């Protein structure tokens, strides 16, 4: 009664999967497996009443457990790392994650219990395991606090007498600039000697987060270190070679 | 009796694969297999009511458990993904389907129970197996709703007072376009001292996802870029060097 009672379930499971509307050699090969796999336990489970010896069966039934147990790690992983994320989740929908080790950037769209949703950057959905979740650094671009200008300005070598005055100059600059953030780290300092250049180091930060006022606000930057590169008499310096001739 | 009907079960079998086509020698020796195969199984099973000591049948089959469950890992594994995919997929038949850890890029042809059946782009069939959809990320272009538009305009390093009007140029131009999508990201700024030239980014979205449509969208900008560089007294910036002379 008990085999009936399942294989009467397991049916109705087979013609409710053919409604929902699918291949039907599938279907009957689904309904195989669980036919199996519901003898098997049931065998194992109720295998002394009619049953055989007491060793044997705990030896195949050890041997199949130890087998199935190796061969389901990540799908059980996965589903693991997808409850440990619907407890305590470092990311929320919307935001735009990054990770140094693997290449998972984008913005969450979904969080599922086996896999996450996320929307690239060029407008494609990428599924990523959750496992992943688990033994991977997550950064959150999408919680920053502010946006990092950093550049080289390359001078000629011949340019060393005015290093002092273009630093001090841009440093000025930097300083009165209305879109930069006053309470953060302001850096311009004399620091390489490069193949071809000597090297000056620029390094703030703006108020704002905005993609869009990031970038002007560095155009601004950039055009105003042309300029005042300029009015001091240097320049900036080319790749450089000297050539001795036969 | 039960040997018996067993041996006939399978020398059914044998004749069934040699009558299907195949190699003779191959079918003896897989028949021989399945018969060394459920003598083992029997004698486990079977063994105490003619058996052995149950000490000895219990580190036997144990060790013989654990071997072979360690050694078919991969198999099993690759069927679990195949129910996996069957009740829970991230793509169906048809989707061009990608992703950043391992080389499967194309178009879906076949989902199976052990391999996924994938046509490339050079039109020749790859087979992947399932597994490896449980723990790499997978990408969809297949459901992209727009196709992106990326390009770099170097300027030359004399053409520093004229970068505005250009960038407003290109703005206006990429805005006016009617191939180009106005509710997505578009950026038009100066932000990059490359080595020999200025650098322009430019980042827009059109509507359509054809390929061929948008292969012809991106020449025309182009072209209108070249144009609108041009028009302006600018040009695009050769590789340069500085040569000094003996
Ligand atoms: C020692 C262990 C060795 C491996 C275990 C057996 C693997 C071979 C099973 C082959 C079964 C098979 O080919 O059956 C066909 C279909 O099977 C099916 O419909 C799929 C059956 C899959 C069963 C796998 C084992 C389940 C175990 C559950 C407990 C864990 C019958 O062909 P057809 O007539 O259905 O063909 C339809 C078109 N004519
Ligand atoms: C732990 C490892 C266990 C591994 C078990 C592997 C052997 C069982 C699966 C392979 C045989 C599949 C035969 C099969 O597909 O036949 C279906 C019924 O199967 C059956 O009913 C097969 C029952 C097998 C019971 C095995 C008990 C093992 C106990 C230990 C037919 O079903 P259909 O009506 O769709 O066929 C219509 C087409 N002929
Ligand atoms: C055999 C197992 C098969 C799976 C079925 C079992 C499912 C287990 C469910 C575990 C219950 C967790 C209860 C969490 C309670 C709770 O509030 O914890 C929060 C999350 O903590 C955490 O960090 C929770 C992490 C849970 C990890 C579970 C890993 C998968 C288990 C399999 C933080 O604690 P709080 O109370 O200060 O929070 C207050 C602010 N919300
Ligand atoms: C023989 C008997 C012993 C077996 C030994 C282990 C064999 C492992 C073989 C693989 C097992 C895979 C288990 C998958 C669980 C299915 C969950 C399910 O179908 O419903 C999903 C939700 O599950 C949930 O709600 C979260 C479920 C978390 C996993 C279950 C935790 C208890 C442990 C269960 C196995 C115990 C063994 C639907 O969600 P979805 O995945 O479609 O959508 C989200 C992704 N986008
Ligand atoms: C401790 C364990 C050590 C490893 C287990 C034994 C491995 C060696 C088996 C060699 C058998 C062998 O060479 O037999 C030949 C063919 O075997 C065959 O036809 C293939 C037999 C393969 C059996 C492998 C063990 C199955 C165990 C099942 C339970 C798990 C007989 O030669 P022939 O006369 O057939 O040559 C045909 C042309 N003349
Ligand atoms: C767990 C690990 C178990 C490992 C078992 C390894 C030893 C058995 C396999 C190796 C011997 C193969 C001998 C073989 O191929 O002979 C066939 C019959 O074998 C047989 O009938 C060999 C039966 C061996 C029974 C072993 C019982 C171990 C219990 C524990 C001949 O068959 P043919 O008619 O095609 O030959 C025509 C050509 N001579
Ligand atoms: C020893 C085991 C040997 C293998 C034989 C056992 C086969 C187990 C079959 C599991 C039955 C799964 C039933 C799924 C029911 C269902 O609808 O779940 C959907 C898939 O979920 C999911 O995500 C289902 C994931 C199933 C993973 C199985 C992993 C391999 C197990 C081995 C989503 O759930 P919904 O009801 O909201 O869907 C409504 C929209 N279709
Ligand atoms: C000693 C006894 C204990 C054994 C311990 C584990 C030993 C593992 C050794 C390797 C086992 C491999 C099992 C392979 C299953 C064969 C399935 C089969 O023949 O029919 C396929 C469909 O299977 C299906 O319908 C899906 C079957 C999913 C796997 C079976 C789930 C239950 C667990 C069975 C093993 C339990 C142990 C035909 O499809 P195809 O692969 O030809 O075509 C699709 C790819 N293009």
Request: proline residues 3%; hydrophobic residues 45%; contains cysteine.
């Given at each position: 009664?008990?085999?009936?009672k399942?294989?009467?379930?397991?049916?109705?499971?087979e013609?409710?999967?053919?409604?929902?509307?699918?291949?039907?050699?599938?279907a009957?090969?689904?309904?195989?497996?669980?036919?199996?796999?519901?003898?098997?336990?049931?065998?194992?489970?109720?295998?002394?009443?009619?049953?055989?010896?007491?060793?044997?069966?705990?030896?195949?039934g050890?041997?199949?457990?130890?087998?199935?147990?190796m061969?389901?790690?990540?799908?059980?992983?996965?589903?693991?790392?997808?409850?440990?994320?619907?407890?305590?989740?470092?990311?929320?929908?919307?935001?735009?994650?990054?990770?140094?080790?693997?290449?998972?950037?984008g913005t969450?769209?979904?969080?599922?219990?086996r896999?996450?949703?996320?929307?690239?950057?060029?407008?494609?959905?990428?599924?990523?395991?959750?496992?992943?979740?688990?033994?991977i650094?997550?950064?959150?671009?999408?919680?920053?606090?502010?946006?990092?200008?950093?550049?080289?300005?390359?001078?000629?070598?011949?340019?060393?007498?005015?290093?002092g005055?273009?630093?001090?100059?841009?440093?000025?600059?930097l300083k009165?600039?209305?879109?930069?953030?006053?309470?953060?780290?302001?850096?311009?300092?004399?620091?390489?000697?490069?193949?071809?250049?000597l090297?000056?180091?620029?390094?703030?930060f703006?108020?704002?987060?905005?993609?869009?006022?990031?970038?002007?606000?560095?155009?601004?930057?950039?055009?105003?270190?042309?300029?005042?590169?300029?009015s001091?008499?240097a320049?900036?310096?080319?790749?450089?070679?000297?050539?001795?001739?036969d």
């Open positions: 009664i008990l085999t009936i399942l294989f009467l379930l397991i049916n109705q499971f013609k409710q999967q053919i409604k929902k509307g699918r291949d039907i050699t599938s009957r090969i689904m309904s195989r497996i669980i036919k199996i796999t519901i003898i098997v336990v049931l065998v194992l489970l109720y295998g002394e009443h009619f049953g055989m010896s007491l060793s044997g069966l705990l030896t195949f050890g041997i199949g457990g130890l087998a199935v147990g061969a389901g790690k990540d799908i059980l992983s996965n589903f693991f790392s997808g409850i440990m994320l619907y407890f305590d989740r470092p990311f929320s929908i919307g935001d735009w994650i990054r990770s140094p080790d693997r290449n998972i950037e969450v769209a979904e969080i599922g219990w896999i996450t949703k996320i929307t690239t950057f060029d407008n494609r959905p990428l599924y990523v395991p959750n496992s992943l979740f688990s033994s650094s997550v950064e959150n671009p999408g919680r920053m606090t502010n946006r990092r200008i950093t550049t080289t300005i390359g001078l000629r070598y011949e340019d060393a007498a005015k290093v005055v273009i630093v001090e100059a841009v440093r000025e600059m009165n600039h209305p879109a930069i953030d006053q309470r953060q780290t302001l850096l311009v300092y004399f620091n390489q000697f490069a193949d071809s250049s090297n000056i180091m620029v390094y703030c703006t108020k704002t987060t905005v993609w869009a006022e990031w970038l002007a606000a560095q155009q601004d930057v950039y055009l105003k270190i042309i300029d005042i590169v300029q001091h008499g320049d900036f310096a080319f790749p450089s070679q000297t050539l001795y001739m």
